[PDB]
């Protein structure tokens, strides 16, 4: 319950749907395959609440972090009406996650009974209660629990950290239920359950069994990030695990964002990801020109001298703001002369641009074209 | 260009310049401040959401000279180069934030300062690049410098006149000979530095020029322009038509804007509310490094202080986030901060403009003068 998910069909294992009845009020309706909209703090990188409104296709959901809210928790907390509140869009959806995938910290800081996280004044080291007090004075719609994702830091592959990532984050997952049980504040709000066990088949088979049995509103495929991208094992590994979730629930993914790997992990049951690969790019003066109808093969690099008598928008054919209004010369000027307003107008340009590609993803799956979708991105990715 | 005067109160001008020939500019007045000719932090978008913009926008040599080529080779001139191409822009030399050193103008050149480092301007290069960028108005090629030197002295002072006459005449020559340049209009520019015989000549002399208004240079100040120079400047501008608009360069702050306008002065640079934005400050003086017209919003005192940054601003950032909501972007180092202080800031130093202009059609000048420096102190 506090969501309904409907499945269109599913073709060769990708889940095309809907959830409804979602977030706190019970009113909003998101599509999967999906992305939510990344952000740190709540409020979208680079853009007002008004300017994110001039972007096409911005999911239901926004993704903020506890990496970069925990150390304001007791500001947070004395406000008391939540973050969406806080940031004056009392009316958002927010899912909140754990880390932010951005700027993970060290490894190795995950005990029994707490973890850490980073925020931009350092290490906030949360204990069970610790960490549900402060989901109490964010009160996200949905908010990952606790977890140990480490397992697979480890130098080499041991069957008791594996199960000890699967023990912890259920003995996490469990404390928070009954702790969010005692709660005023977070009855409308929805735990995810997050999958572990590491490389480990049975613990990650067992990490999925058990968790299925609490009542969390979804669950989050946790520990598959890549360097560069999810290896051939771990998407068996994937599906593997997803095959024994139920289906009227959604699959999260954190850490998964380059659309060559969304495509790999939807083929495999994962119904939402992060968008962060899109703020990447435009972190570096980027801008993504791949078609769908260090930086990678699917953008063009604005700084670069050859774009300065460019012309041309970032992408033909694109009806974003930048592209509306603005030259790839242009926007290579303004980064030479250091005007901020770049990384407002790449922002705008990479995030529609993003999202128009999960919209042609739902559209491949409707018109049974997933196959040429991926190897045309594949293509351009060689 | 058309100037109208309204009424003329105590020294202040009151009234409109237009034929611009469908756009207006109010004097008293401010251009507003860019550097590239993108407002700071701003979409065109957002800045159309900003009450009380001014009709003309300031760019500068600073950030432009360097990228000539790409502007010449674009030939469409600066406003349809940055998406704007109804604006209209006036061009001074140097950007007033960041105008780079002292010391580089010759009776030959002058250097501008950007990114990229020093750009050398003889007459020819420079009105080169006013072809290319094509401006509604552009300051002469001038010395603003002597009053640069160690010492006041009367060669330095001289040759910053005879220097700008020289840079002028040969700039209304080249001008006359440029089809694309037949509907820009130049402003001559003042200089002569602190010895008050050459500031005079200097107007006298500017003022036998064709010239479509004045740009009054070298009277900025730290923190203020002096009372010497507002001596200076009242001597000037009674020797300048009265027809044809005052502009001064560097002077923003608004005590310094007040003393201005009360000796003739018609236009101003908003640059002022650009840096208490990149200071992490916000505007809040009343008009009904840091100055004591705003407050700091990274100070821990408004992390929990949930009114806006002013109230009753209609700006967006007041009408929507709090003080405690601002502070919060800062320390998580996002910067939406520095958008939504520009928006404000702006706002609320345009809003201190529309207020100067009501109070001299009231004939209340002198009381918005005292408000203004009851809250410097
Ligand atoms: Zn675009
Ligand atoms: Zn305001």
């Not at 060290?106 to 925020?119: E, F, I, L």
Request: charged share 25%; glycine share 8%; hydrophobic share 35%.
């Amino acid at each position: 319950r506090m969501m309904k998910l409907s499945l269109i069909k599913v073709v060769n294992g990708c889940r095309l749907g809907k959830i409804q009845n979602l977030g706190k009020a019970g009113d909003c309706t998101v599509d999967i395959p999906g992305c939510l909209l990344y952000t740190r703090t709540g409020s979208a990188p680079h853009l007002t609440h008004q300017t994110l409104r001039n972007i096409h296709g911005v999911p239901g959901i926004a993704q903020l972090t506890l990496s970069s809210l925990a150390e304001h928790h007791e500001v947070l907390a004395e406000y008391k009406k939540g973050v969406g509140s806080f940031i004056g869009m009392p009316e958002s959806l927010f899912y909140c996650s754990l880390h932010d995938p951005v700027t993970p910290g060290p490894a190795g800081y995950v005990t029994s009974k707490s973890v850490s996280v980073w925020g931009f004044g350092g290490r906030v080291e949360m204990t069970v209660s610790k960490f549900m007090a402060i989901q109490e004075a964010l009160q996200p719609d949905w908010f990952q629990c606790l977890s140990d994702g480490e397992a697979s830091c480890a130098e080499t592959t041991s069957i008791k950290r594996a199960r000890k990532s699967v023990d912890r984050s259920l003995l996490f997952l469990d404390s928070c239920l009954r702790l969010q049980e005692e709660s005023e504040v977070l009855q409308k709000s929805v735990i995810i359950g997050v999958i572990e066990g590491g490389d480990v088949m049975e613990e990650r088979l067992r990490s999925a069994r058990e968790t299925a049995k609490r009542p969390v509103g979804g669950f989050l495929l946790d520990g598959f990030q890549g360097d560069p991208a999810v290896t051939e094992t771990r998407l068996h590994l994937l599906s593997s695990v997803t095959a024994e979730l139920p289906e009227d629930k959604p699959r999260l993914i954190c850490g998964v964002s380059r659309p060559d790997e969304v495509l790999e992990c939807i083929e495999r049951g994962v119904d939402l990801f992060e968008s962060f690969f899109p703020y990447q790019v435009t972190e570096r003066g980027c801008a993504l020109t791949f078609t769908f109808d260090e930086m990678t093969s699917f953008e063009i690099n604005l700084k670069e001298k050859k774009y300065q008598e460019d012309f041309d928008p970032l992408v033909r054919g694109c009806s974003c703001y930048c592209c509306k209004n603005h030259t790839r010369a242009y926007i290579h000027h303004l980064l030479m002369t250091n005007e901020l307003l770049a990384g407002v107008l790449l922002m705008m340009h990479n995030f529609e641009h993003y999202f128009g590609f999960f919209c042609s993803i739902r559209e491949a799956l409707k018109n049974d074209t997933l196959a040429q979708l991926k190897e045309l991105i594949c293509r351009q990715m060689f």
